[PDB]
Symmetry: C3
Subunit: 179 residues, 3 copies
């Protein structure tokens, strides 16, 4: 598993090698970090009551993995994998879950059920990856669809976090000092 | 009620009093505060027992103060009064002395972990400190509510303190760094 | 006592051999090692089974070694002796060889997830790799104990290897990229 070729700080990317602190590798790594959190959250959504959300998450892990591949491409040796079609799929689901969840009355704070809490954490990591992608874009040309996808994904995560709390008979945690 | 507007699909976003790139140090500080807040929210799910009523309510309040920190940090040129005050920082200090007093004597570095609850608080602790580094960067570019830096600095001590109390109440002994002379 | 001294309220803090701003790359590397160590601490709570005493015990040791990594990185101009040596890196290598042998043959690309224990280890893996990127950035500004870079590099491989062994022992298949 270990080749030791990266022991000095450089690593391999599609079409070349770069320093491990290259913004391209930071973006790629944070996408991986975000994908890991979704993997954890998924171990809490295996029940029948969450088949819909769980299957979508499995697919999202593949798409997130594809985002990584699209970003770690110094020399375009292959077309991009992430397409606008995948963003629209996220959009259709977000509309469905916003309809399912109760009306949003107050500002939401991350937390509630264990499952929703983990999804809330994954959401913040996805947002941190988005900032890295924005930085990357400032230096090199990127698959702009990846930025739209990661941007839309945190909204999807926000949507299901609320649906998850609702299904589990737990109210969302709200910003409310009158409570 | 439609979450996505797509206005941020190109990398820019809104802040209080203007628009900036999503990788602006300001948005990063704000985002990391949110990240820290999410870890505290997860940790809380493990602290609803009757043995942690005091800590749970404090974390509940802290989620609000942390959210307020993000609001103060996302304010450009200050169109509204800041929300984070020294009073909230002092409240943190009084609790820390209380928890240090409750926990067994601390004489050396300890491994972060133990109980599931304390482990999560320890992670939240590191994310808060990460947020602190971003706030420090922010302050070098623009004027901020300096109280927010004090609060974030002090909050990680609070988290360190309750993590040890949680393990203690759960009878999980701290593991001291094996470099015994440190 | 007073855990807080308030000397850091203005944005500066001390390292071994001086004081610097908290956003200095040295403090960031140090901080991210602490973050990675904390994630390992959480993962360990999921590996308390009698079937995981070996992995748990090795992770506990790694936590001490991560503290050594932290200390080494905080040393300004070799104010004091470095503690992380090549011996610890090779120790990781031997365990990796053993775990690759234990786990089933790796055929497809793995996505982070599976058993909750493995899922949490995968997350810790990404944080370790994030810590590595900061160390690489630090090394570009100052001379560091190069062995810490090798250790942190090899560490993520160790974590990846035990994640798979953990799923295997729990009789859970690894989540693989497959659509
Ligand atoms: N610290 C890191 N953060 C994010 N991505 C990384 C990091 N290190 C490597 N990668 C990416 O992940 C892939 C595989 O990782 P791996 O650790 O095998 O690379 P390496 O460190 O260069 O090799 P080695 O582990 O043998 O030293 C590489 O193609 C590289 O682009
Ligand atoms: N990636 C990010 N990290 C941290 N904070 C963000 C990020 N994106 C947006 N924000 C902040 O959070 C708030 C709401 O997030 P939201 O995602 O709705 O913004 P946006 O991305 O600009 O809009 P849209 O999602 O419709 O494209 C904004 O006011 C913005 O300042
Ligand atoms: N935000 C941070 N991220 C990473 N490492 C830090 C951070 N703040 C401090 N450190 C490091 O950890 C050590 C102890 O942390 P501590 O918070 O006690 O320092 P401080 O903030 O300077 O002091 P005080 O908390 O009394 O203001 C210091 O030696 C410092 O190098
Ligand atoms: Mg957005
Ligand atoms: Mg401090
Ligand atoms: Mg490596």
């Amino acid at each position: 598993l270990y080749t030791k070729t990266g022991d000095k700080g450089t690593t391999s990317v599609i079409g070349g090698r770069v320093d491990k602190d290259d913004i391209r590798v930071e973006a790629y790594g944070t996408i991986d970090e975000a994908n890991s959190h979704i993997g954890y959250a998924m171990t809490k959504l295996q029940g029948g009551a969450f088949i819909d959300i769980y299957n979508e998450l499995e697919n999202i892990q593949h798409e997130l993995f594809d985002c990584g591949g699209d970003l770690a491409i110094v020399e375009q040796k292959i077309p991009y994998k992430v397409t606008i079609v995948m963003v629209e799929s996220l959009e259709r689901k977000i509309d469905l879950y916003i309809e399912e969840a109760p009306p949003l009355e107050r500002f939401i704070l991350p937390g509630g059920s264990e499952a929703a809490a983990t999804i809330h954490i994954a959401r913040t990591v996805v947002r941190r990856a988005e900032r890295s992608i924005v930085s990357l874009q400032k230096e090199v040309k990127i698959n702009e669809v990846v930025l739209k996808y990661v941007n839309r994904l945190s909204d999807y995560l926000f949507a299901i976090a609320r649906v998850i709390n609702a299904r589990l008979q737990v109210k969302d945690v709200e910003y409310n000092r009158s409570a």
